[PDB]
Design a protein around this ligand. Structure first.
Ligand SMILES: *[C@@H]1O[C@H](CO)[C@@H](O[C@@H]2O[C@H](CO)[C@@H](O[C@@H]3O[C@H](CO[C@H]4O[C@H](CO[C@H]5O[C@H](CO)[C@@H](O)[C@H](O)[C@@H]5O[C@H]5O[C@H](CO)[C@@H](O)[C@H](O)[C@@H]5O)[C@@H](O)[C@H](O[C@H]5O[C@H](CO)[C@@H](O)[C@H](O)[C@@H]5O)[C@@H]4O)[C@@H](O)[C@H](O[C@H]4O[C@H](CO)[C@@H](O)[C@H](O)[C@@H]4O[C@H]4O[C@H](CO)[C@@H](O)[C@H](O)[C@@H]4O[C@H]4O[C@H](CO)[C@@H](O)[C@H](O)[C@@H]4O)[C@@H]3O)[C@H](O)[C@H]2NC(C)=O)[C@H](O)[C@H]1NC(C)=O
Ligand SMILES: *[C@@H]1O[C@H](CO)[C@@H](O[C@@H]2O[C@H](CO)[C@@H](O[C@@H]3O[C@H](CO[C@H]4O[C@H](CO[C@H]5O[C@H](CO)[C@@H](O)[C@H](O)[C@@H]5O[C@H]5O[C@H](CO)[C@@H](O)[C@H](O)[C@@H]5O)[C@@H](O)[C@H](O[C@H]5O[C@H](CO)[C@@H](O)[C@H](O)[C@@H]5O)[C@@H]4O)[C@@H](O)[C@H](O[C@H]4O[C@H](CO)[C@@H](O)[C@H](O)[C@@H]4O[C@H]4O[C@H](CO)[C@@H](O)[C@H](O)[C@@H]4O[C@H]4O[C@H](CO)[C@@H](O)[C@H](O)[C@@H]4O)[C@@H]3O)[C@H](O)[C@H]2NC(C)=O)[C@H](O)[C@H]1NC(C)=O
Ligand SMILES: *[C@@H]1O[C@H](CO)[C@@H](O[C@@H]2O[C@H](CO)[C@@H](O[C@@H]3O[C@H](CO[C@H]4O[C@H](CO)[C@@H](O)[C@H](O[C@H]5O[C@H](CO)[C@@H](O)[C@H](O)[C@@H]5O)[C@@H]4O)[C@@H](O)[C@H](O[C@H]4O[C@H](CO)[C@@H](O)[C@H](O)[C@@H]4O[C@H]4O[C@H](CO)[C@@H](O)[C@H](O)[C@@H]4O)[C@@H]3O)[C@H](O)[C@H]2NC(C)=O)[C@H](O)[C@H]1NC(C)=O
Ligand SMILES: *[C@@H]1O[C@H](CO)[C@@H](O[C@@H]2O[C@H](CO)[C@@H](O[C@@H]3O[C@H](CO[C@H]4O[C@H](CO)[C@@H](O)[C@H](O[C@H]5O[C@H](CO)[C@@H](O)[C@H](O)[C@@H]5O)[C@@H]4O)[C@@H](O)[C@H](O[C@H]4O[C@H](CO)[C@@H](O)[C@H](O)[C@@H]4O[C@H]4O[C@H](CO)[C@@H](O)[C@H](O)[C@@H]4O)[C@@H]3O)[C@H](O)[C@H]2NC(C)=O)[C@H](O)[C@H]1NC(C)=O
Ligand SMILES: *[C@@H]1O[C@H](CO)[C@@H](O)[C@H](O)[C@H]1NC(C)=O
Ligand SMILES: *[C@@H]1O[C@H](CO)[C@@H](O)[C@H](O)[C@H]1NC(C)=O
Ligand SMILES: *[C@@H]1O[C@H](CO)[C@@H](O)[C@H](O)[C@H]1NC(C)=O
Ligand SMILES: *[C@@H]1O[C@H](CO)[C@@H](O)[C@H](O)[C@H]1NC(C)=O
Ligand SMILES: *[C@@H]1O[C@H](CO)[C@@H](O)[C@H](O)[C@H]1NC(C)=O
Ligand SMILES: *[C@@H]1O[C@H](CO)[C@@H](O)[C@H](O)[C@H]1NC(C)=O
Ligand SMILES: *[C@@H]1O[C@H](CO)[C@@H](O)[C@H](O)[C@H]1NC(C)=O
Ligand SMILES: *[C@@H]1O[C@H](CO)[C@@H](O)[C@H](O)[C@H]1NC(C)=O
Ligand SMILES: *[C@@H]1O[C@H](CO)[C@@H](O)[C@H](O)[C@H]1NC(C)=O
Ligand SMILES: *[C@@H]1O[C@H](CO)[C@@H](O)[C@H](O)[C@H]1NC(C)=O
Ligand SMILES: O=C1C=CC(=O)C=C1
Ligand SMILES: O=C1C=CC(=O)C=C1
Ligand SMILES: O=C1C=CC(=O)C=C1
Ligand SMILES: O=C1C=CC(=O)C=C1
Ligand SMILES: O=C1C=CC(=O)C=C1
Ligand SMILES: O=C1C=CC(=O)C=C1
Ligand SMILES: O=C1C=CC(=O)C=C1
Ligand SMILES: O=C1C=CC(=O)C=C1
Ligand SMILES: O=C1C=CC(=O)C=C1
Ligand SMILES: O=C1C=CC(=O)C=C1
Ligand SMILES: O=C1C=CC(=O)C=C1
Ligand SMILES: O=C1C=CC(=O)C=C1
Lengths: 624, 624
């Protein structure tokens, strides 16, 4: 096993455990110290203003199993500190008959048991578990734990009658899943249900959704309401909040609703961030975010989606969330977005970026799998003075349109996502910033033009504004992680409305994914404008490439170039001419970003272990 | 619910939880503070000379489940102290995927991991578990834990490859069971295997048996040997030690070998107690003790048996234990005898006495189930100068015979059992002792003659020697727990060789068992004697009646008289005449015995709990 990154890669499958630990590893984002991680969980702003972030964790393994909550905290979403207790960085683990198969996702009641922060989590036990298997009641239940030390440790309620698990009866028969409880307060839902509380006797100030579906009949989000304020044992099932069809699709802009929902949440946003009104704010919009499974041929059969909804009150004192329009939270190799409230009327979302090693060829050599996305402020994105001649504008697929009185302009509303400003400020301030001269891409543009300043390593951000003619057939974008022999190409093609990441040349290592990523981007043309603009921000962090367009479209993916000098970046141009010119301005390179884990050494591997021959006898976990 | 014990019992099923806690409860023996208990486990003499006793425990429940080790210690087998830690009197509990279904029986390696006392125990996980079900590999494994604080707490080895569980592969296919590991040293087996250790490479100084059987083909005791001295991970399967047929019986004196063995152990005894020779002591005998299941119509389908064995070395470097003769450890409502070495060349055995409430009608009102037997010294019982005219003597059923040179007398060898002397000394010393005048039971004997001194409560011992003509048809014995309307009759009938406990009148409460108990007793007639003698000792302790005959035959049973004055005792006589006289001598009453748990108040109930609706979903435990 040679680690010589100045020559072609050898047979890296011969390398020892964690020998490639630092080679591709993100340094500027949330990631476990080592081993397997997946979904964010247990997210809350603590009383001291810091952020507590949990995550699905399997230390010293590179596949899922014994799933536990790993945890850390930060004052700025950007620089993190691990918890360190009797179980290292874990703070909740399988320990009881009701959760021995795994401590799945959960969410926080900020003032719960005895006034302490409280997690409601999916406690799993034995039996077939999955949307494509014949799951039975009891395999997935919902349980409580609380913390008296701000997340350093959690105390589970006792096992038994009137204690854990607190939710165990299936609300409908033949579920595909019953997990990922999302607890939230909602002045809006309280106001809508206030006339019906005699029907259900549920009058608490917390709601919870549970994610799942019904065999042969599509996904379901189930809505519960806390039976009594200040009491956390009894949760009353109201009814299904979101009902979608078996592999139903709202279309090209909206992914596919698959057969089962995972990690669903409910929020209410306005142009500034989180909205806490009862329905009185005419600028606020109700949103559901949710993962779907088995409605996609690739990306692990997983869509991370969102929908704007209009609530209707049913005669049985429940809520129907009718989908108004429906979009995609991230078009790439990410899933399991969680959102949580943050002081200053913010709703912050973060997801998991999986690797692109689906055959598990170099996972042991890495010694880890998975990272988070960046933390994103959610808000209602409003575009004013939109031209009615914007192609496809009135399909209203993943946006709403509202005509002016005179019908000559349109207000566009959609979900906005932007990186939290604390992270952008820390990244810029710690980086070597190069402000680049604006560039017209015309008949003289090479296919690839390196920037006048180059990154020094695999940790940088790029920004640019790409101005196109209304009738362009030109393509432009960014090349990143680039040498002569390895590179990753980020293209926008306004004529097709497609943002692509071409990875045919991303790496000389053949075992990593090399499929083209694709997002749809609608350029809302402005009344009076003779051009249309793409604002593109790209984060490069080890192997992560995380793309943001127009504070709306996000695409996370992975690139694993072998060569030490595959770090370069620049502009891409295709079909640019004297007539079809792409104007590039606001160009900046941030070289270096931030060390997100300053207390951690470069190599936090503790080695890998095998569960031994019993792993196959129990049949629950891969065992490695 | 009336607790008036001066009138007929009402409908006691209306009484609250633990309202009958003190009514029938033993006070002079080992019993859990409250709730469910079954098999003794983890028995060892600690370095300070005290006895550590574990037991299968389910606190705050009256049925089996979440089975754990409860524990206590004693300097004299008689007066006990509970451990008290984070889990109350428990010291091992389900906590890992490999043992979450229960911490079953286990036994002690006195100098184990890092030199500490170490338990090898059956760690159970999910799946069908039972001799009549289709069990699969992994459901029952064998795991290690060690104690750095003399049994106050136990540390399990980690889960995984080269750690727990340490024994998981089934040594043969289609097992009925795979549990109750019994660890022992054996100079005898080491000497027998010393010429074969090149075949198996197993050279350690500890052996272990695992109890089970093969579907359709009878019980098996599997023999393992520690692979290397001082190392406790690797145990090498040698082969089956004991192989019996599907519901095979050696006869009327020997119970039935059923379909599956439980709680089996291996020892070597001589006339004085434990034998540590390599085979050189011609007076020593190899013994196996074992429970069998599904070879009995009653007593919970359970026989506690023992056999004398002759070891043969197989060509594959394993041991066959050939049964020489085969007997019964206790003929009553007891099971799961464990034996362990004690300083002074002793082997001490103790079992579990279950209740006689098999339909669980008053278990909640009790607030507990189960007790131990008394602690018994095992030894080789040798009877010299036995007359060859002793009826049935040469069947050699549960004994061996050796003729004198001249063929006119016989030495009889069998398993001896006697109560440990520490308990007899403490009982006698703390009691009001009444030495009773000898009685000839003749034509003038009433059916029942109360003793000249009477017990004051349900805690007493009786002893007597009953001398019969060689051709008697008379019956005699003891009546205990007796008023005019409730009583329990203990009869011996030499003509049938039957010791019976008649319980038709034991209680006015109809829901308790009232079936007649039966043991076989061989009176070895001595050369020159014109009579034969039964030495009978009876312990009455709450509801326990524990009978010992001739330091050989034991019979544990239960009686639950309601009336406060059902405490009396005396002599029984049937068919005694001027010609057929039963001489009764050495009569003594020990009134009071000892308070075995001086630190405990009379009512140690903590209430009962229900596991709730998930108990039926998991399907592992009753839930109460
Ligand atoms: C199979 O058997 C299993 C084993 O028995 C069983 O699991 C056990 O279940 C029991 C019952 O549910 C659990 O017991 C609960 O424990 C909770 C505390 O749990 C935390 O702490 C314990 C103890 O921690 C000590 O010991 C450890 C180990 O040594 C140390 O590491 C600690 O530092 C600490 O040490 C100090 O204290 C020791 C003595 O205890 C000293 O010896 C020592 O020197 C130290 O000074 C830990 O063991 C726990 O860890 C385990 O669990 C966590 C997850 O929680 C895991 O991550 C971890 O790996 C372990 O598995 C844990 O950290 C108790 O709070 C709880 O007691 C409350 O509830 C019960 C009712 O259920 C009440 O009766 C009781 O009064 C308490 O209620 C009051 O208190 C709370 C808040 O304090 C209130 O909300 C509540 O309303 C109530 O208030 C009362 O008082 C009020 C004011 O005073 C008043 O106003 C009210 O009116 C009211 O009266 C309970 O004891 C036990 O932890 C489980 N153990 C394990 C190992 O899992 C399992 O379930 C069984 N399974 C089945 C299928 O049956
Ligand atoms: C799913 O995830 C689960 C959770 O992660 C996982 O379970 C966990 O498994 C891990 C890995 O097996 C277990 O970790 C082991 O822990 C053993 C100790 O266990 C006892 O103590 C812990 C810790 O106790 C502290 O904290 C608790 C809780 O707060 C307190 O109550 C205690 O008082 C104590 O507190 C002090 O210390 C704290 C910091 O730790 C401080 O914060 C605190 O302030 C205090 O001062 C308890 O939690 C355990 O309780 C749990 O387990 C018991 C049963 O054991 C239950 O009854 C209970 O309910 C709980 O469930 C328990 O009491 C360690 O000994 C062990 O470390 C040894 O082994 C590993 C290898 O496996 C080595 O890497 C390591 O070096 C150690 O080996 C050395 O030491 C031993 C002897 O000391 C030697 O025999 C050995 O050879 C070696 O020697 C070394 O040194 C020699 C000389 O120095 C040298 O010569 C040698 O060469 C060599 O180097 C390991 O850490 C963990 O306990 C499990 N946790 C739980 C909650 O279950 C589960 O398996 C997963 N499941 C699956 C399917 O994957
Ligand atoms: C005395 O100790 C007991 C513990 O033993 C404590 O707890 C009680 O324990 C008993 C079992 O011993 C429980 O009984 C069972 O209850 C089931 C239905 O219960 C629901 O209704 C009652 C009101 O009438 C409520 O009290 C319960 O509330 C509690 O549980 C809920 C969760 O549901 C919590 O949220 C609450 O906070 C409470 O803690 C329940 O809502 C019932 O299904 C079950 O029935 C079986 O057993 C009986 C008797 O043998 C049969 O008649 C019946 O047919 C059922 O038999 C099943 O088993 C057979 C074979 O044996 C199968 O063939 C069938 O499939 C069948 O299903 C049982 O009655 C009791 O609920 C529980 N009470 C609690 C927790 O409060 C007592 O509290 C304690 N007393 C005191 C004062 O401390
Ligand atoms: C680097 O990290 C790893 C942890 O990932 C550490 O541990 C190793 O982990 C791997 C898995 O990653 C283990 O590999 C598996 O080994 C199985 C057979 O192992 C036995 O033989 C070897 C010697 O050749 C021994 O080393 C083992 O000893 C250990 O375990 C025993 C218990 O058995 C303990 O008592 C010891 O003390 C040791 O701790 C074993 O005795 C093997 O069955 C398994 O095979 C599957 O996977 C491979 C590769 O993918 C396939 O080729 C193969 O076909 C098997 O595929 C299964 O799965 C497919 C589908 O995927 C199914 O269709 C089939 O049914 C099939 O069964 C695998 O190779 C390895 O044993 C383990 N080593 C240990 C613990 O020492 C490393 O230690 C660590 N390295 C360092 C230096 O730290
Ligand atoms: C980068 O590395 C490769 C291999 O060492 C080398 O061939 C090439 O000239 C270097 N520079 C580039 C591609 O910019
Ligand atoms: C990282 O640390 C682990 C654990 O000590 C070690 O096995 C591995 O070889 C190291 N990897 C690198 C890149 O240094
Ligand atoms: C309320 O009605 C809805 C719509 O029919 C139904 O799906 C749901 O189960 C009902 N809620 C109940 C029965 O609690
Ligand atoms: C919105 O405006 C467009 C362009 O003026 C027009 O075609 C359409 O009919 C309008 N919709 C409504 C509801 O007025
Ligand atoms: C560098 O990053 C840290 C960690 O996020 C941040 O607090 C600090 O303000 C940054 N430095 C700047 C912007 O100068
Ligand atoms: C004992 O109690 C019963 C019921 O109170 C009474 O009838 C009887 O005379 C008393 N004495 C006896 C049976 O010795
Ligand atoms: C024993 O104590 C328990 C628990 O406090 C109580 O419920 C029960 O009624 C008491 N029983 C008696 C006989 O006093
Ligand atoms: C040794 O031989 C016995 C008798 O045939 C057999 O039952 C046992 O399995 C053998 N031991 C092995 C294969 O380890
Ligand atoms: C043992 O003694 C009895 C009575 O003398 C006799 O019948 C029998 O044959 C003897 N057995 C042997 C082996 O000598
Ligand atoms: C009474 O019992 C205790 C507890 O077993 C024992 O130590 C003591 O010696 C006994 N008293 C006597 C025999 O006088
Ligand atoms: O495969 C299936 C499992 C369960 C069910 O309800 C329908 C189909
Ligand atoms: O769906 C998939 C999940 C994980 C993996 O390794 C490959 C495919
Ligand atoms: O450079 C490249 C070579 C071959 C291919 O198919 C894509 C890119
Ligand atoms: O109108 C415009 C068209 C294209 C371009 O590059 C800039 C402006
Ligand atoms: O948080 C930390 C995790 C691991 C390590 O080695 C140092 C710090
Ligand atoms: O859980 C499992 C682990 C390993 C294997 O081979 C099959 C199932
Ligand atoms: O019932 C049965 C279960 C298992 C087996 O091997 C034979 C019979
Ligand atoms: O076999 C049996 C065991 C327990 C019980 O309650 C009744 C019968
Ligand atoms: O006293 C008794 C009454 C009836 C019976 O069958 C047995 C004893
Ligand atoms: O020989 C004897 C027969 C009977 C009896 O009671 C005493 C002596
Ligand atoms: O050992 C003891 C158990 C229980 C109790 O209450 C007092 C002492
Ligand atoms: O384990 C079980 C508990 C209760 C029940 O009704 C069925 C099974």
């Amino acid at each position: 096993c040679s680690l010589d990154q100045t020559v072609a890669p050898g047979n890296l499958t011969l390398c020892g455990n964690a020998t490639l630990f630092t080679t591709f590893r993100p340094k500027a984002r949330f990631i476990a110290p080592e081993g397997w991680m997946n979904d964010p969980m247990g997210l809350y702003q603590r009383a001291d203003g810091s952020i507590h972030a949990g995550y699905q964790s399997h230390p010293k393994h590179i596949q899922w199993g014994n799933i536990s909550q790993g945890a850390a905290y930060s004052s700025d979403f950007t620089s993190w500190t691990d918890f360190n207790g009797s179980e290292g960085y874990k703070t909740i683990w399988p320990s009881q008959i009701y959760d021995i198969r795994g401590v799945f996702d959960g969410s926080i009641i900020k003032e719960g048991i005895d006034g302490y922060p409280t997690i409601l989590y999916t406690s799993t036990s034995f039996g077939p578990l999955g949307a494509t298997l014949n799951e039975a009641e009891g395999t997935e239940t919902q349980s409580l734990a609380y913390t008296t030390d701000d997340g350093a440790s959690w105390i589970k309620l006792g096992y038994g009658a009137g204690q854990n698990p607190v939710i165990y009866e299936w609300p409908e028969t033949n579920l595909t899943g019953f997990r990922d409880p999302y607890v939230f307060q909602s002045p809006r839902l309280e106001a809508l249900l206030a006339n019906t509380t005699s029907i259900t006797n549920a009058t608490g100030d917390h709601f919870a959704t549970i994610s799942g579906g019904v065999h042969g009949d599509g996904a379901r989000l189930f809505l519960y309401r806390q039976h009594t304020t200040g009491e956390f044992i009894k949760w009353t099932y109201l009814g299904p909040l979101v009902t979608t069809g078996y592999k139903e699709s709202y279309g090209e802009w909206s992914g596919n609703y698959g057969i089962n929902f995972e990690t669903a949440g409910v929020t209410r946003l306005n142009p500034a961030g989180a909205a806490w009104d009862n329905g009185s704010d005419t600028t606020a919009v109700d949103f559901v975010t949710f993962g779907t499974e088995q409605g996609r041929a690739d990306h692990q059969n997983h869509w991370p989606l969102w929908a704007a909804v209009d609530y209707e009150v049913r005669d049985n004192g429940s809520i129907e969330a009718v989908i108004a329009y429906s979009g995609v939270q991230d078009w790439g190799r990410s899933y399991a977005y969680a959102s949580f409230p943050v002081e200053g009327y913010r709703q912050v979302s973060v997801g998991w970026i999986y690797e692109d090693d689906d055959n598990v060829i170099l996972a042991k050599q890495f010694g880890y799998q998975g990272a988070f996305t960046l933390f994103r402020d959610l808000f209602v994105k409003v575009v004013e003075n939109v031209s009615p001649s914007t192609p496809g504008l009135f399909e209203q697929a993943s946006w709403s349109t509202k005509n002016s009185t005179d019908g000559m302009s349109v207000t566009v509303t959609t979900l906005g996502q932007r990186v939290v400003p604390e992270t952008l400020a820390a990244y810029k301030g710690n980086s070597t910033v190069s402000t680049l001269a604006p560039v017209m891409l015309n008949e003289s543009a090479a296919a690839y033009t390196p920037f006048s300043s180059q990154p020094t390593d695999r940790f940088y951000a790029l920004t640019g504004s790409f101005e196109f003619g209304l009738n362009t057939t030109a393509k432009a974008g960014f090349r990143v992680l680039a040498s002569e022999e390895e590179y990753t190409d980020i293209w926008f093609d306004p004529a097709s409305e497609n943002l692509t990441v071409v990875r045919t040349a991303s790496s000389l290592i053949k075992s990593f994914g090399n499929d083209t990523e694709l997002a749809k981007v609608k350029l809302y043309e402005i009344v009076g404008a003779e051009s249309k603009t793409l604002n593109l921000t790209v984060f490069v962090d080890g192997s992560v490439i995380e793309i943001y367009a127009n504070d709306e479209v996000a695409l996370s993916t992975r690139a694993y170039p072998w060569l030490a000098n595959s770090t370069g970046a620049g502009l891409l141009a295709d079909g640019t001419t004297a007539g079809d010119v792409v104007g590039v301005s606001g160009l900046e390179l941030w070289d270096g970003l931030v060390d997100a884990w300053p207390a951690r050494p470069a190599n936090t591997s503790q080695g890998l272990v095998w569960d031994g021959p019993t792993a196959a006898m129990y049949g629950l976990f891969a065992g490695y």
